Design an enzyme around this catalytic site. Structure first.
Site, PDB file in Angstrom:
ATOM      1  N   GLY B  15       0.732  -1.249   0.080  1.00 14.98           N
ATOM      2  CA  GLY B  15      -0.012  -0.078  -0.137  1.00 14.98           C
ATOM      3  C   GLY B  15       0.728   1.341   0.105  1.00 14.98           C
ATOM      4  CB  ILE B  22       0.494   5.069   6.822  1.00 13.59           C
ATOM      5  CG1 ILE B  22      -0.225   6.207   7.696  1.00 13.59           C
ATOM      6  CG2 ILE B  22       1.002   3.994   7.894  1.00 13.59           C
ATOM      7  CD1 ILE B  22      -1.354   6.014   8.029  1.00 13.59           C
ATOM      8  NE  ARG B  45      -0.677   8.071  -8.073  1.00 11.98           N
ATOM      9  CZ  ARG B  45      -1.884   7.709  -7.354  1.00 11.98           C
ATOM     10  NH1 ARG B  45      -3.208   7.904  -8.042  1.00 11.98           N
ATOM     11  NH2 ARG B  45      -1.918   6.818  -6.309  1.00 11.98           N
ATOM     12  CB  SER B  46       1.327   3.143  -6.601  1.00  8.12           C
ATOM     13  OG  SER B  46       0.397   3.792  -6.262  1.00  8.12           O
ATOM     14  CB  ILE B  96      -4.793  -1.696   1.235  1.00  5.12           C
ATOM     15  CG1 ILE B  96      -3.424  -1.903   0.617  1.00  5.12           C
ATOM     16  CG2 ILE B  96      -6.021  -2.032   0.451  1.00  5.12           C
ATOM     17  CD1 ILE B  96      -3.109  -3.212   0.139  1.00  5.12           C
ATOM     18  CE1 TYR B 159     -11.744   6.519   8.465  1.00  5.04           C
ATOM     19  CE2 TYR B 159     -12.763   4.913  10.059  1.00  5.04           C
ATOM     20  CZ  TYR B 159     -11.767   5.428   9.074  1.00  5.04           C
ATOM     21  OH  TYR B 159     -10.657   4.452   8.753  1.00  5.04           O
ATOM     22  CE  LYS B 166      -9.151   1.745   7.930  1.00  2.00           C
ATOM     23  NZ  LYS B 166      -7.973   0.989   7.290  1.00  2.00           N
ATOM     24  NE  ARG B 196      -2.135  18.929   6.595  1.00  2.00           N
ATOM     25  CZ  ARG B 196      -1.351  19.231   7.669  1.00  2.00           C
ATOM     26  NH1 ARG B 196      -0.530  18.568   7.758  1.00  2.00           N
ATOM     27  NH2 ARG B 196      -1.731  20.295   8.267  1.00  2.00           N
TER      28      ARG B 196
END
Ligand SMILES: NC(=O)C1=CN([C@@H]2O[C@H](COP(=O)(O)OP(=O)(O)OC[C@H]3O[C@@H](n4cnc5c(N)ncnc54)[C@H](OP(=O)(O)O)[C@@H]3O)[C@@H](O)[C@H]2O)C=CC1
Ligand SMILES: NC(=O)C1=CN([C@@H]2O[C@H](COP(=O)(O)OP(=O)(O)OC[C@H]3O[C@@H](n4cnc5c(N)ncnc54)[C@H](OP(=O)(O)O)[C@@H]3O)[C@@H](O)[C@H]2O)C=CC1
Ligand SMILES: NC(=O)C1=CN([C@@H]2O[C@H](COP(=O)(O)OP(=O)(O)OC[C@H]3O[C@@H](n4cnc5c(N)ncnc54)[C@H](OP(=O)(O)O)[C@@H]3O)[C@@H](O)[C@H]2O)C=CC1
Ligand SMILES: NC(=O)C1=CN([C@@H]2O[C@H](COP(=O)(O)OP(=O)(O)OC[C@H]3O[C@@H](n4cnc5c(N)ncnc54)[C@H](OP(=O)(O)O)[C@@H]3O)[C@@H](O)[C@H]2O)C=CC1
Ligand SMILES: C=C(CC/C=C\C=C\C[C@H](C)CC(=O)C[C@@H](O)CNC(=O)[C@H](C)[C@@H](C)OC(N)=O)C[C@@H](C)C/C(C)=C/C(=O)O
Ligand SMILES: C=C(CC/C=C\C=C\C[C@H](C)CC(=O)C[C@@H](O)CNC(=O)[C@H](C)[C@@H](C)OC(N)=O)C[C@@H](C)C/C(C)=C/C(=O)O
Ligand SMILES: C=C(CC/C=C\C=C\C[C@H](C)CC(=O)C[C@@H](O)CNC(=O)[C@H](C)[C@@H](C)OC(N)=O)C[C@@H](C)C/C(C)=C/C(=O)O
Ligand SMILES: C=C(CC/C=C\C=C\C[C@H](C)CC(=O)C[C@@H](O)CNC(=O)[C@H](C)[C@@H](C)OC(N)=O)C[C@@H](C)C/C(C)=C/C(=O)O
Lengths: 259, 258, 259, 261
Positions: B15, B22, B45-46, B96, B159, B166, B196
């Site tokens: 991820g 993170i 792109r990643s 992820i 959220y 989660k 951020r």
């Protein structure tokens, strides 16, 4: 390095070694191997003789031992002032202290004596509040305080009785301390250890029953030891756990997660 | 005994998207401690960003794999392929999550069936299948860590569907911990405070939450990717032996207060 | 206002009766005795035949039965619009619906299929979100929604596997619904029932094992029944539980409190 | 014995500990239990509470006022109080516990400054009281019954300014669980109500109480505060057989504040 377990230049007070089996000794062995300077505290003289015998197993140049019965404001206040004089500022405290009268633990919880209940609260919970106030004097840059708890503070377990209410008190103590001393960059956390064969635990009814239930039912199908608690203590006491406070880490083979 | 030396350890990190991810904080930290790192991404792109980022690290061999966790095949093949290219691993860091902005902007009661199951699929089920395949590469045992947020434990404003995802993830961790425990595989979560990131940037009033953490949280400050990485080092290494089914809050103590 | 369990002039939708053993029927028997008008919903035609047979045991003048498979947006939207036409505004909904594929429940939880996981989530959790959205249309004054959960949503329990992650989803669903619909004076709560012998539960491995563990280890040393769930449902659905929302009440002989 | 669900408490007797004035949570419990037709026994510490109780009993429909002086710090006053209740009214069906105290010195302070005497005082009155009350009341409940204690969110989370009382409430909440497991086999249920903030004698004149009231109205799901009667309604549920099969439970009567973060 961002991440470090190198504790040379760090000094930690370890309260509650009694013998080689003490959880606090597991914490000591681990912090020692990582190169920390260790101050020790004890109540009984029997614990002092054992400590001096044990320090030979460690790599501490200077034995700094102090008699602190956490029931005495004076012994705690003087003990910490004296530590401040002998070694200077500290980076944290590991708290490994609890007691209840066997009469209260053997009983039905509803039969618990007022004196027995307040005794359990005094040693097992309040001790952390005053230890924190005095140790804060030696931690003007910040530091980490860790206390040792058991699942019985979160759930009613058979036979833990008055000590369960003491551990719930301790666990809330940790949270209120975390909120109070946070702005002074002092972190306060707890380790919820699974059952370990120690001096305190040896000769309390049905302790072998719980050890076997952990092996059979807990996710890892095994018990934990003092060193595993020590490893998690290293994490919480060091800056590796920066940003963690008011937390309760279960070192218990996952028993807390199952029902 | 106690060691943060991770030479001879290999970890898959799922991820990374950019330098703010993170998962990259986890990578920087595990790298400094000398671990061999395998990386997984979804978008191309990643991949471009990852190759640019690996120069910041000290990884001899770049091992990058395309895994969209929505595809059983991409996950199964990805992990078989990792097993062939680097052999057995010591753990997986899962970083992820996704929900449709339509669902997050809405009132939670307006959430679409498709949007809810999408959030569940990417943000929770992904860990179950990742765990099944990664188990193949961890016959000696290992550690799996997933990233969660307080919103899985309490209703937090905005959220919405991701909170239920989660809570699903957090229960996923516990059931995986009980299942893979006898195989000496530990499964834990880190509950990060607000950071951020690419995912978080351009969700309304994110600066408002950052400031509330600074004002109300015990440590009176926000956390960063590296602090998550430090706690990830603890959970992924043998330092956290005997810890499984646990949720460690790296959130300046915000979880402990009301 | 002052305290009453007289539910004449109250109307409640009850989703998930299948047979006489269904938890939802325990809720129905209780709400009926207290004089509520009851609307019922079912999926299979087998449940309809049973419902009509069962309504004779109740004191409902007019049988209002509606086919709603919660997997269909349309059957849910139309079902509730139709209830609004036939009986007008309602005071609450009791949700008693869950399902997972036995293949997923028999397995190791790590073997769970993507389709089986999302199925459990769809029926057992998302259903409550869309039911809530449509029922809100019939509750402009306010009302109470209750869903049925199990301890396995809070702790990893042997054999509950995918349904545990579905119940954790449901329990979080309840919280987010409580925060969303609170300002519209709609309360959303859950009952965590202990094990009960039902159509759904009959022939799922080791259910007799859990029943016996509850009798032996739970504080009340006994199992609970559908009516005890119904009694707590009466409390949550009525104005007796005003000021309670986002709550999970364990009707489980205290099993949740112990370890 | 015809409705399975019943809130009819004629032929039920409940001891209510901790009425001080008309604003006391315990009085909200009394008003509600009275309306449902229960016989009520009351307990107080200070004489000021007795004068107020007698004035308040006129608002109720209790034929005979049974009032008893019990300071929960005294084993004797608690043991004798309950023996005496057993003599004057016979067997009871439950106890509502609405008792806490900490020194204002400790509450105003930083929590780390708390005195050993202040901490053990908070524990003694606010938590241990329930353990001994439970032991003695069990003597009057051979058929079974229900014990309820009053707590606050501050027992589960660090709340600003609650300090030593938060650790006392965490103690109380664990007390409830251990009592539930101990007295369960005697068919005695032990539960807690976590009340949201209410303007009472105990709460009046502690700094920033108006701040929390306003935060509840703004942030809590129901966007409103709760009152003594709402606690009383949930107390009726927990004290009656309506809550059969519920023990070791903590019901938040707090407009949903506990569920949000
Ligand atoms: N063993 C276990 O399974 C578990 C233990 N814990 C907790 O871990 C901690 C340590 O327990 P453990 O290592 O088993 O037992 P130990 O026998 O090592 O610990 C008892 C310790 O408490 C000290 N102590 C007791 N009262 C006082 C006092 N008033 N002042 C100063 N020291 C005091 C003793 O000193 P002295 O002998 O000199 O009086 C001794 O060092 C405790 O908090 C315990 O509740 C938590 C989970 C599990
Ligand atoms: N930011 C925060 O404050 C917090 C974040 N978290 C959690 O931390 C984790 C990482 O968040 P953050 O660092 O903001 O994320 P970033 O958006 O910076 O990275 C998110 C990653 O999710 C990946 N991803 C999304 N969908 C899929 C998919 N279908 N298959 C494979 N990979 C996918 C993205 O890859 P791609 O772009 O290739 O799709 C991206 O690499 C998440 O679980 C998030 O919930 C938790 C607490 C706080
Ligand atoms: N029994 C137990 O021990 C416990 C059960 N629970 C929970 O209690 C609730 C009630 O279960 P229980 O009384 O055992 O179940 P039942 O024996 O009533 O059987 C399951 C019920 O689910 C309904 N249902 C399933 N899928 C759908 C769908 N797609 N749309 C609409 N309805 C559907 C069934 O209707 P049909 O068959 O007519 O399609 C039936 O009414 C569940 O949510 C369950 O997880 C919780 C704790 C304990
Ligand atoms: N008000 C609030 O916002 C909330 C309060 N609570 C809790 O509710 C309970 C009652 O609260 P509240 O109505 O505010 O309190 P009140 O002060 O109105 O009543 C408090 C009671 O405690 C009694 N008390 C104090 N010490 C003793 C003692 N040693 N022996 C016997 N009784 C004693 C007082 O009696 P006397 O004065 O005669 O000594 C008084 O009746 C407490 O547990 C409190 O912690 C919980 C949530 C919210
Ligand atoms: C449920 C468990 C089973 C055993 C029951 C109760 C355990 C209570 C632990 C408590 C700390 C024991 C005492 O207070 C001991 C004391 O009364 C007598 N022993 C001593 O004085 C010795 C010599 C010294 C060393 O004692 C002390 N403490 O100083 C709980 C088990 C399974 C888990 C445990 C042991 C948790 C814990 O330690 O808190
Ligand atoms: C309460 C919080 C405020 C933020 C509200 C909603 C944010 C939810 C997080 C969720 C993961 C966001 C998305 O999935 C974003 C996506 O829908 C649009 N963005 C993208 O697709 C970009 C390109 C990619 C990289 O993003 C992803 N995810 O792939 C929660 C805040 C305080 C904390 C957070 C961010 C928690 C969390 O991430 O779970
Ligand atoms: C540890 C427990 C033992 C039971 C294990 C798993 C049970 C899960 C409950 C779940 C809802 C059962 C099914 O989905 C059954 C299904 O596969 C076959 N049966 C049916 O389809 C019947 C005809 C219909 C009516 O069933 C449904 N739901 O549609 C958990 C136990 C101790 C507690 C329980 C039973 C919890 C619960 O039921 O949720
Ligand atoms: C965090 C909140 C904001 C206010 C902070 C602390 C309040 C603590 C409550 C505590 C029980 C009250 C006292 O101990 C006050 C006492 O020292 C002075 N008052 C008295 O002595 C009068 C005469 C007697 C009648 O009172 C008692 N109890 O003896 C908590 C708030 C928002 C919620 C509350 C108030 C909870 C609670 O009461 O537990």
């Amino acid at each position: 390095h961002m991440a470090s377990l190198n504790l040379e230049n760090k000094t930690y007070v370890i309260m509650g070694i009694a013998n080689k089996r003490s959880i606090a000794f597991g914490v000591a062995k681990v912090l020692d191997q990582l190169g920390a300077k260790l101050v020790f505290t004890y109540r009984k003289e029997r614990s002092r003789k054992e400590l001096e015998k044990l320090l030979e197993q460690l790599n501490q140049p200077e034995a700094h031992l102090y008699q602190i019965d956490v029931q005495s404001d004076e012994e705690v206040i003087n003990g910490f002032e004296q530590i401040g004089k002998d070694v200077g500022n500290i980076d944290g405290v590991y708290h490994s202290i609890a007691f209840a009268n066997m009469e209260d633990l053997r009983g039905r919880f509803s039969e618990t004596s007022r004196e027995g209940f307040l005794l359990a609260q005094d040693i097992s919970s309040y001790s952390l509040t005053i230890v924190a106030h005095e140790a804060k004097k030696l931690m003007p840059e910040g530091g980490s305080i860790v206390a040792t708890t058991y699942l019985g503070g979160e759930f009613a377990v058979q036979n833990y009785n008055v000590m369960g209410v003491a551990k719930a008190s301790l666990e809330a103590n940790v949270k209120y301390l975390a909120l109070d001393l946070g702005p002074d960059n002092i972190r306060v956390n707890a380790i919820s250890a699974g059952p370990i064969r120690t001096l305190s635990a040896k000769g309390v009814g049905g302790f072998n029953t719980i050890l076997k239930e952990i092996e059979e039912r807990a996710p890892l199908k095994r018990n934990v030891d003092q060193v595993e608690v020590g490893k998690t203590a290293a994490y919480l006491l060091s800056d590796l756990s920066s940003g963690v406070t008011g937390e309760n880490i279960h070192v218990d083979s996952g028993f807390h997660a199952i029902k």
